[PDB]
Amino acid sequence: GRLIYTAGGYFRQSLSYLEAYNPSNGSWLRLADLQVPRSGLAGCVVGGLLYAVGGRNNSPDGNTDSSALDCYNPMTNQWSPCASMSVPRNRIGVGVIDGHIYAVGGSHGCIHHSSVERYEPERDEWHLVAPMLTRRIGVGVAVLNRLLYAVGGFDGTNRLNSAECYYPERNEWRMITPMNTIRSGAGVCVLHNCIYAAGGYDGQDQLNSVERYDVETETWTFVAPMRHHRSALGITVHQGKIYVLGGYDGHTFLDSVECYDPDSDTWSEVTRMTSGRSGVGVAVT
Ligand SMILES: CCOc1ccc(S(=O)(=O)Nc2cc(CCCC(=O)O)c(NS(=O)(=O)c3ccc(OCC)cc3)c3ccccc23)cc1
């Protein structure tokens, strides 16, 4: 009975939506608005609480990058402010290891971060850990085998096919095999022991291609492409399937939600969001 939560996003301006999709019955839930609009944020869940991390308020009155961490309790339908990050991080990536949230990369103004910081919910504190080898905004993050992977992005000059791996016990980063495709703004997740990179922007076009990394063969392999080209898409895994939400296709802010079945290597349309948007944060609880 877990739900797919989508927070924030962008259509004409940054959005305040929190909505939840129930894949069992197809219902969409309209939940409490974020306290401040944001796009380019990431979502994650620790201990049944949903967290909205980073991003930016792109508004008619100006644009402000966010250092915010906000905590949503599904039992109370209430957002509460948590401790802010050391620095604003728009187009951030996040992963969770052992109950701690890692905020990876992103931008503050024209500064493209390589820094990474770790949130401990029991203490409501952030601390910096070792920075990545590469500055990355629009970065995808996946956690596998208690290791954290930072995939793709944009370093301020180069759009990246590179990826790297963080070892929390050693507090160090190592480059891994780069993807077949340059991707910023991709959806990155873990499914059945593989890291998936879906969509994104390769410097020329939004992408519908999807590739996955096998950590033991150290190889990236293309799988079935999605039905729509998407950059700045939301992504999550629910019941052994990947769900991708929204994104920009080069012309339209999509409302489409597709689902990847790894057993059949096929994508299907499962629902539409209540309105088209990109740059959402997504998580499941
Ligand atoms: C008409 C599109 O308007 C938009 C489109 C998205 C939005 S957002 O709120 O989701 N924030 C975000 C913006 C951009 C950069 C988009 C800049 C752009 O499209 O010109 C990202 N980077 S990207 O890797 O996806 C990309 C980069 C260059 C590009 O070059 C195209 C020439 C195309 C796409 C984001 C990556 C992750 C999360 C949020 C992102 C707001 C307005």
Swiss-Prot record:
Effect on the protein of changing residue 159 to A: Does not affect interaction with SQSTM1/p62. Abolished interaction with SQSTM1/p62
Mod. after translation: Non-enzymatic covalent modifications of reactive cysteines by electrophile metabolites inactivate the BCR(KEAP1) complex. Accumulation of fumarate promotes the formation of cysteine S-succination (S-(2-succinyl)cysteine), leading to inactivate the BCR(KEAP1) complex and promote NFE2L2/NRF2 nuclear accumulation and activation. Nitric oxide-dependent 8-Nitro-cGMP formation promotes cysteine guanylation (S-cGMP-cysteine), leading to NFE2L2/NRF2 nuclear accumulation and activation.
Coiled coil regions in record: none
Knockout mutant characteristics: Early postnatal lethality caused by abnormal cornification. Mice survive until weaning and probably die from malnutrition resulting from hyperkeratosis in the esophagus and forestomach that cause gastric obstruction. Defects are caused by constitutive activation Nfe2l2/Nrf2, leading to constitutive expression of phase 2 detoxifying enzymes. Mice lacking both Nfe2l2/Nrf2 and Keap1 reverse the hyperkeratosis phenotype and are healthy and viable in normal conditions.
Kelch-type repeats, residues: 3-48, 49-99, 100-146, 147-193, 195-240, 241-285
Result for mutant: residue 56 to A: Impaired interaction with SQSTM1/p62. Abolished interaction with SQSTM1/p62
Domain of life: Eukaryota
Family from the record: Belongs to the KEAP1 family.
Subunit structure, interactors included: Component of the BCR(KEAP1) E3 ubiquitin ligase complex, at least composed of 2 molecules of CUL3, 2 molecules of KEAP1, and RBX1. Interacts with NFE2L2/NRF2; the interaction is direct. Forms a ternary complex with NFE2L2/NRF2 and PGAM5. Interacts with (phosphorylated) SQSTM1/p62; the interaction is direct and inactivates the BCR(KEAP1) complex by sequestering it in inclusion bodies, promoting its degradation. Interacts with NFE2L1. Interacts with BPTF and PTMA. Interacts with MAP1LC3B. Interacts indirectly with ENC1. Interacts with SESN1 and SESN2. Interacts with HSP90AA1 and HSP90AB1.
Name of this chain's protein: Kelch-like ECH-associated protein 1
Organism of this sequence: Mus musculus
Residues included from the entire protein: 325 to 609 of 624
